[PDB]
Design a protein around this ligand. Sequence first.
Ligand SMILES: [Mg+2]
Ligand SMILES: [Mg+2]
Length: 319
Amino acid sequence: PLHIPPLPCPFPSEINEHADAVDEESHTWLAASHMLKGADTVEHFRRSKIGTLAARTNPTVPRDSLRLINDWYNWLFAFDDAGELMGHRASALARALPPLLEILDGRREPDGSDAFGLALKELLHRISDVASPAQVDRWRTTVKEYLFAQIWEAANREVDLIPTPDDYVLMRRITGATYTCFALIDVGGGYRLEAEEWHHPDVRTLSDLACDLIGWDNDLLSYAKERGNDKARHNLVTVLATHKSLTLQDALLEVAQMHNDAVAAFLDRRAALDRWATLPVRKYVRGLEHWVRGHIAFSLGSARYVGAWPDDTRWPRAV
Ligand SMILES: [Mg+2]
Ligand SMILES: [Mg+2]
């Protein structure tokens, strides 16, 4: 039987007080968007409690901010899930991006037939209502990078390759859209990091470590579920097992070791940041901590993730 390694994390684990009410509001918004095809998928999303992830990763923000962030998570989950099999055609996916970039740049009104485009325009305008032009463009840049990164996944599927560790660790930071969520921490909190605060090497280093932790933790806990989706090709467990000739168990343990090394590096760099940080930088870094820890709590507690593992699988003690 397999044993799931613990993912120890000293960061506080909290949940927004508006979690259940906003989850319901946001799911209703997604169900009415027409972004999902089929009552079956709509019901799967409802049971997934995406608002729980939003509330655990943004536990301090006001109700209106949580609703905006929850709608954005629902857009991302829907976009990832959904058609023309463009996930296996790099050329076709690349050629399908310009119309979406036009909408993101505010250069074209979406067509009434374009569920993803209509919802993206709506979210851009709602973010613009509570964010400066510099904050809007910081988010827009992370979304463009996420969209371009989808072509890289399609490229791997097209030639049936499992990506190498180095290529995967770099690209996994942008394929998962986590940076698009980090870009809304100051916005959701009602504050604004200055350009030189945001781009300070210490803030970028902590942001990159948090983004690694979230991607690797998600890859490990979703692994059993992801085996039913393109043989979990885009998953650090598959990548390490394949390229380092490991057993599934030793691959799981190496992901947990990478997690522990990343946590140590985060604590080390945060001590250096604690010397100079302004209140907004300190709130942003606490935001990164809540995101990493809240994501673990959500993923550990997911019926769909836990259920996919074989019945004899051993889960670690609560850390
Ligand atoms: Mg994906
Ligand atoms: Mg300035």
